Subunit: 117 residues, 3 copies
């Protein structure tokens, strides 16, 4: 899975090690091994969420197979919201998530594409 987190919290207000804890959490929530989880955190951005520039975060989650239905995504959403609200000290109105299914022909790995592996 690929997780990308944009936030307007400065880097020195994002708790140390968040990217590692998010990686471990995502492995458990999405049911994928941690060695297949990728996290990117981009702090210090200029953001508005729901029309407001108060602290916020945007998460994008992309994966093969497990983010393609409302039922799956509802379950994932609950856990990611709990993690981010408590780690970042944000209310639930200050986070949004987008989910994006991928297919194996779209992923370049070790100089080839996953569809051929």
């Amino acid at each position: 899975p690929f997780l990308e987190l944009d936030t307007n919290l400065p880097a020195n207000r994002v708790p140390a090690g968040l990217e590692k804890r998010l990686c471990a959490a995502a492995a458990s929530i999405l049911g994928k091994p941690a060695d297949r989880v990728n996290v990117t955190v981009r702090p210090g951005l200029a953001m508005a969420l729901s029309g407001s520039t108060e602290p916020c975060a945007q998460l994008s989650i992309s994966s093969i197979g497990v983010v393609g239905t409302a039922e799956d995504n509802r379950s994932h959403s609950a856990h990611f919201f709990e993690f981010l609200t408590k780690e970042l000290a944000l209310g639930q109105d200050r986070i949004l998530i987008r989910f994006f299914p991928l297919e194996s022909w779209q992923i370049g790995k070790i100089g080839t594409v996953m569809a051929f592996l």
Copy 2:
């Protein structure tokens, strides 16, 4: 709607309050309430646009319903180009926009997904 703007202008060359003015402009252009508009600005990046590293900006717009046809997007493009060229003092050859339709099963909000709300 979700608007993401990448630019190679340094942060201190992006006019103060751009994210708030872009939020208000997008509400009017896309016909959505401002309390449903989200903006992310990422300045100080290393960019080339059309093969050139001169100042530039990339905008991505994602939304349910209103960014899914050429006719709709042509109208939106005109207004976003006017806004960004004049706010950022860029020529029209230094901006590109990408439009991405979303569906409600893809959006995590308040610990669930929009399809269930």
Copy 3:
């Protein structure tokens, strides 16, 4: 084409001019003129790739026509991996690529959309 590169290398460990050399390389690899190639580099991010926070890079490539099959993407992957591993001094296990087809109705250019040009 649009290329977006996220890395946890600091800006002063990304070789000077990478965005320009990546632009030229992508024109040759994807078979598009350099004046249609766009590159964005976002350094200094907090990242984990395959569960590890060691230096890494994520590349996203979006284009009309040329990134839509496994066979095409396998060819592109080989060249982009060679470029990035050698420029950034990374092993092949520290890079992943995502490929995204676009259509002309999605691209805003000079105040309109490409479908009308």
